[PDB]
């Protein structure tokens, strides 16, 4: 049962852009100071960061929101290009908070709202150069996932290791670095693309445009739909075609694939959560819930509860139902009537007589699961 | 005004005008009216009842306010205003309806009547001999495009 | 409430709104109206009177509820709500019409007024000098798509 | 336009034009037509029916849009436009018909009329004593070779 | 006409004429038409569509304007005009149709009808006992070779 009560439960310590905004961690050719994470469009991005001259992955993964569906995204700089240490698992693509300094890293985003996804394009940029041992990578991916779990309303984009066969991913997934969490997902094959600064080819991780798809998908249909069949616009080719005999082994363990389809182009096909929990296996379901939570929590935003009183309960019940009945009227929910499609409860049994400080307990039923 | 509970009472209507009228008894039919429009639309290819778009937002209606002067007298004020209008000499006026309440010094509500305020009708009362309860009142009807609170 | 026989009486209308209005006298014309449709159909090739299909089931009608505020005061609450509407700034509200029994604590009936709740008209009362029985009331007319018991 | 439920309303149709058509009443007869074609054949030497091919696709039609100026005034804007064409100059111009949202700063739909557009007619209204609701409207007819959203 | 907002109204249509058409009811069927032309061609030896040339400009049309005299009287002004033409004299004349402002001294729009204008018809109204609202109107039809503002 995800919080159905509050932004924080034990202490009331607390006293838009849409789902398309995401954040990326990596190095810039130039860039602004690295701490003030900024959110913007390609047009201004390049003016501050640089025209791919540093050889960094942010220079390319940024297009995920510009050569595909998008608007703006947050960028954490970490540091810039050397003229004409950051490759360690500690700084940069790390939980590099700086002891409450919100320094470049998963920690620097803790103070920032309105982020639905977080990617780290330069973690593997120096995989070979910086000798990023497996754990050096694993530790960062764990830090990213933990960040997302703690914020509670955004998810992690996890990169596969740089170059390995299907057997070897079955291996890290089951034997050396499985993550098992409702807050993360991974795609396997690497994508060939070009780099106009110097020539026809570069290899990039299945991120960037892959995330651009989520923004596209949300505009086409409610977040309920999965982008289980969508074009990776901007892709040139794939390193490997993964056949049915391989899909049979990878989909059951949560590895999403991108394939070149005979007459349809390069498309995203897999749509599973990198999680062991049957409830959260499907990505579109995990997303539907984050979607509803962001909008309902912003909507019913009252600060400092006055008197625990039925009159507030009545205002709340009425507002939640008014919000949800449209999901039913529209095609998002299942059921012949609101009666079955959704459930709202807020009365003295969720808000018992002790009435200690915060009340406002609202119980809700989605389709089968309960909040 | 002195208390949170009291509702304004009919102390006095009062008027600003560029024409020197002096005493009246009343002001009728003042309103602020927005026009409504709507559609019925079918649902999202689901056999669910469609929606009624009843919040489409049109322009604002226009009307006139009727006033009654205490009575006929030798004054020609309302007659000449209508004569300029009938003669084709544009002569509109800016008005201000003020419902002064209690303290005549305190005038909390004042309503703007666009200058296009223009007198269209003058109506006499009934003259009946022996009807010794009646006085002759005059009715002035003024049309206006816009009223602002 | 205490007995099976008694019928609720006019203790008080009460309202939820996101706009801080404070005191009213009344609520008029609240209804739940389903539309009827019908056909006449001939019998099964037998010269017997045909049937009247009077249970065909259409959609539901939409209307508005009129309220009267105790009176004019220096408050600008009803004026600004209508100004946002006239200005084209969508600003609908969610309402709740509540009936409270002899026990003000006991509120057994509450009716949902879709957030559509949109003010269309504001009407002033009559201002007549010397009519010392009258107070100036304000009439607010609010249109709504859907009412749920 | 916060919801999928609203539709554009007749809030403010307006026009990009070098000729000073500053104030208007209305715009009509606007359409987009692709001409179809229809052929019937007998089938391939067997016991089946013929076929109808209606997937044939001929070119795009052209037309004109009616434009109504509220009425005559002393500024002969449209009269000179027609005089230039009658005189023999290819005095054509590009135009833009704009559809505007409730909150007018939002201007989502525009239609581009080809640079070859020109005026072929100027039509006067009826002038009859006492008509009152007849207010000397003018109708301008403009030919639009090509219309693109 | 102190503002851009007014339009000419049906205040006083009147006519410059040597024939004593002193009092009238109305004027109708007044228009200005330039004839267009339409040609379709295939494009210049390449994979593009044909073109539509509608910038072609043929000559100017001519017509007649309906004139209604309030009714029959003893003065046979129009009857003789038609008699002169029936007799074979080219009894044509220049005319001026004038549009007048609210303040009638202001006379901003005039249309010149060519000197070759003449009367082809005189039409009587219906004469029926008791009709009352039928008041023996006469319709005069005049051909206008050329109309210039």
Residue numbers in the entry:
A (entry chain I): 1 to 15, 28 to 96, 232 to 518
B (entry chain b), C (entry chain c), D (entry chain h), E (entry chain g): 1 to 149
Sentences from the paper on this structure:
A conformational change in the baseplate complex triggers the contraction of the outer sheath, which leads to the propulsion of the inner tube into the target. Here we provide evidence that CIS from the model organism Streptomyces coelicolor (CISSc) function intracellularly and belong to a new class of CIS that exist as free-floating fully assembled particles in the cytoplasm and mediate cell death in response to stress conditions. Similar to the recently described sheath structures observed in AlgoCIS15 and tCIS19, the CISSc sheath is composed of a single protein, Cis2.
Different sets of two (IE), three (IEG) and five (IEGVG) amino acid residues were inserted into the N-terminal linker of Cis2 after position G25, resulting in the mutants CIS-N2, CIS-N3 and CIS-N5, respectively. In vitro, the length of the CIS-N5 non-contractile mutant was homogeneous at ~230 nm. Next, we optimized the purification of CIS-N5 particles and performed cryo-EM. Helical reconstruction was used to generate an EM map, which we then used to build de novo the sheath-tube (Cis2-Cis1a) module in the extended conformation at 3.9 Å resolution. Domain 3 of the extended sheath (Cis2) was again too flexible to be resolved. The tube (Cis1a) structure and fold are highly similar to the tube structures already described for other CIS. The comparison of the sheath (domains 1/2) in the extended versus contracted states revealed an increase in diameter and shortening of the length upon contraction, similar to other CIS.
